[PDB]
Each structure stands twice: as C-alpha cells, then as structure tokens.
Design a binder for this molecule. Structure first.
Ligand SMILES: NC(=O)C1=CN([C@@H]2O[C@H](COP(=O)(O)OP(=O)(O)OC[C@H]3O[C@@H](n4cnc5c(N)ncnc54)[C@H](OP(=O)(O)O)[C@@H]3O)[C@@H](O)[C@H]2O)C=CC1
Ligand SMILES: Nc1nc(N)c2nc(CNc3ccc(C(=O)N[C@@H](CCCNC(=O)c4ccccc4C(=O)O)C(=O)O)cc3)cnc2n1
Length: 186
C-alpha cells in the first residue's frame, strides 16, 4: 500500500509534549503541512489511516475530531470502546495493521501515518520494513515532560530532498524549524 510513515515535530531538546499538549505555541504552517501529508492520497477511492495514542487524540480539539479526510485510529489499553468521533480502537500496533489487512480496511486503506505518541513511535521503528520518518525540527528549547524515543540513526538515510518537502529552514512566529525525512529498509 503505503509505507509506515512516522510524522513527529521535535524541539531541539527532543520534546514532543507537555501536559497533554504541545511543547510550543501552535505553529500554523507546520499544522497545514501536517494536514498535507497525512490526508493527501494519490490512490483514488482510498483514505490514509493515522494511528494515534490516547493522549494525542485528546490534545486535538474536539472540533477537528475525527481528523478530516483520514481514517482515525486510536490505541489504548484502557478504554473499552473507542473514544467518540474516533473510528477504531486497537489495543496494540501489531493489531492496528492486522485490521488494515482485515476485510473492509483492505480496499480503502492507502497509507498509514504514525502521528504518535511515544510508545507508538516506540512500537513503529522496531519493525523490519519500509519506514520513513517525517521529522519536523523545532530549533529551540521548550520545557516538555514527553520526549522523542531516540532512533539509532546510523540505521537511517537522511534524504537530502523529499517530494514536497521544504528543504530550507522555515520561520513562523519568531520560531525557526526545518523538515528532514529519514529512511530505513531493515
Ligand atoms: N508535537 C508532536 O509532533 C506530537 C506531539 N504529541 C503530544 O505529546 C504528548 C503525547 O503524550 P504521550 O504520553 O506520548 O501519549 P500518547 O498520546 O502517544 O498515548 C496514547 C495513549 O495510548 C496508549 N498507547 C500508546 N502507545 C500504545 C501502544 N503501542 N499500544 C497500546 N496503547 C498505546 C497509552 O495509553 P493506554 O493507557 O490507553 O494504553 C498512551 O496513553 C502530548 O503532549 C501530545 O500533544 C503527540 C504526538 C506528536
Ligand atoms: N509534524 C508534526 N507531526 C505530528 N505528529 C504532530 N502531531 C501533533 C499532535 N498534536 C496535535 C494537535 C492538533 C492537531 C490538529 O488539530 N490537526 C489538524 C491540523 C489543522 C491545522 N490547524 C491550524 O493550526 C490552523 C488554525 C487556524 C488557522 C490556520 C491553521 C493552519 O493550519 O494554517 C489536521 O487536520 O491535521 C494535530 C496534532 C502536533 N503537531 C505535529 N506536527
């Protein structure tokens, strides 16, 4: 279909979260991009699937829930039913994908995106396969409580250029960030 894409925004300090929210002021072009990648499908007829954790689902305003133009999928080991507005519940990343394969998720599912969080990016990586890491490098410190799982990066390729990805350092709201994409076929 599509390959395990991971999409994360990192602060220099390796922070991704802080009290169920973002280590930084919301940055709208970074949001538009995020929207861009995860929704956008070439196969016709098919949606992308975004796999996300309990605390990530919840950070996202009710208002944009479930994310417009993507099958929303939630990972929790505690709810019984999936959070409202949210399309599936899956106790673990191995079954999230089994489901894809399952009967109706089959013809529909085009790519699958890992929006996070921590143990989800944690399950991801540690998979043998075609994984591309879409990394947004917020080039500032923000005190955060939740962090990026570190990637043995001698095992990834840093593509200099990616299809539709800005390659020069971007500056919104006095903040400065840059996009890099990583690969691995292990
Ligand atoms: N800035 C960015 O790019 C990103 C920021 N964020 C932010 O970072 C923080 C997210 O907090 P974090 O603790 O990472 O929480 P997550 O939202 O990733 O947690 C999802 C919940 O789901 C469960 N879960 C997670 N991984 C798995 C798994 N592999 N199998 C089953 N259940 C799983 C855990 O809950 P249970 O007890 O249900 O198992 C966890 O509580 C918030 O600040 C959020 O806004 C998140 C993603 C990207
Ligand atoms: N790289 C990258 N990777 C990630 N995994 C990632 N994860 C998060 C996780 N926490 C959230 C919180 C909110 C939303 C959300 O709300 N989602 C909308 C975006 C619409 C844009 N909304 C705006 O910011 C906005 C608001 C008003 C006017 C203009 C805009 C705009 O985007 O220009 C959508 O459809 O995807 C998503 C994730 C945050 N940042 C990330 N960055």
């Amino acid at each position: 279909v599509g390959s395990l894409n991971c999409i994360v925004a990192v602060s220099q300090n390796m922070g991704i979260g802080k009290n169920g929210d973002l280590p930084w002021p919301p940055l709208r072009n970074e949001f538009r991009y995020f929207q861009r990648m995860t929704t956008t499908s070439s196969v016709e007829g098919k949606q992308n699937l975004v796999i996300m954790g309990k605390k990530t689902w919840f950070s996202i305003p009710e208002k944009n829930r479930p994310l417009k133009g993507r099958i929303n999928l939630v990972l929790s080991r505690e709810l019984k039913e999936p959070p409202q507005g949210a399309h599936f519940l899956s106790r673990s990343l191995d079954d999230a994908l089994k489901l894809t394969e399952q009967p109706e998720l089959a013809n529909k599912v085009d790519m699958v995106w890992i929006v996070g969080g921590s143990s989800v990016y944690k399950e991801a990586m540690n998979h043998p396969g075609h994984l591309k890491l879409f990394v947004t490098r917020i080039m500032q410190d923000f005190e955060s409580d939740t962090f990026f799982p570190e990637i043995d990066l001698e095992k990834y390729k840093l593509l200099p250029e990616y299809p539709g990805v800005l390659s020069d350092v971007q500056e919104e709201k006095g903040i400065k960030y840059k996009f890099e994409v990583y690969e691995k076929n292990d």
